[PDB]
Design a protein around this ligand. Structure first.
Ligand SMILES: [Cl-]
Ligand SMILES: [Cl-]
Lengths: 160, 161
């Protein structure tokens, strides 16, 4: 379907080289479809993708699962915009607590609660199984090549 | 990279788990977020969101006189995700599209690009292509070709679901 779009541009604006639209269109379509598959599993734990990401990132820090907002933001799988209202929501649900920084009275830290820890330890197991199932449509060799080519793209994008 | 660091954290914290699937998917999603930022920065110069750009571009791609049924429009957007209702209304209010009665079914309408919509998208698509070319220039042509092929395989697999 992406090639069909490229063919439309070749007909309608032949003065332009629309070739860059192909890889990016495929990347973004894959990402939307992938997000749907991931959310289908997060929903079983009454979590959104951004909630899972925050809890998983606190889990990955290791006990006692305390991160500064900057550390949290920097080690999320995906960032996009302020955390203010999202952190407030996760505290309202009781999965994190904002705690005073003992080394700076004017700032705070984010800590995973016992209920957040219990939940994310179960959710990450299901998430990995879900991801393994999603990717099972690709041969191992294709997945490996895709991973290395994405890492090359990611390095280029981050270098900008 | 940052995804390798995340995998290292999981290997330390949950060694009972094989976090291998997280790698490619994490890289895919991070690339998409960064790509969206680059695309949106360019669209913003034309006071367009990515979704608005897609609707105008899809009507442009249909060829003159740039009339599509809502279903044709949706089926030829570069990226679909959710209803078109609110975005179509905004584009109509801004005067970039007009809803016209379907002469073969009075109870339904067609979406037509207006001349102001056409003038805008003819300029914006030129900038969009140059923007995308610059974004992808971080890859050698051979690596970009391999990535495009790999993504096509993943896309076909995801669509089969
Ligand atoms: Cl993660
Ligand atoms: Cl397009």
């Amino acid at each position: 379907a992406v090639d069909a779009i490229l063919e439309q541009w070749r007909r309608e604006r032949p003065d332009l080289d629309a070739s860059p639209m192909g890889p990016i269109g495929r990347l973004r379509r894959c990402a939307v479809l992938m997000d749907q598959r991931l959310e289908s599993c997060f929903s079983r734990f009454d979590l959104s993708s951004w909630e899972f990401d925050m809890l998983a990132t606190l889990r990955r820090a290791g006990a006692p699962h305390c991160l500064s907002p900057t550390e949290l933001f920097s080690t999320l799988m995906v960032t996009s915009g302020t955390m203010t209202h999202r952190l407030k929501r996760l505290e309202t649900r009781g999965f994190i607590e904002r705690v005073q920084n003992e080394l700076d009275a004017r700032s705070t830290l984010v800590q995973l609660t016992s209920s957040g820890l219990e939940l994310i330890n179960r959710a990450v197991e299901a998430h990995i199984e879900n991801e393994r199932q999603v990717l099972s449509v690709l041969p191992a060799e294709v997945l490996a090549a895709l991973d290395t080519n994405l890492a090359a793209l990611l390095r280029g994008l981050e270098s900008h």
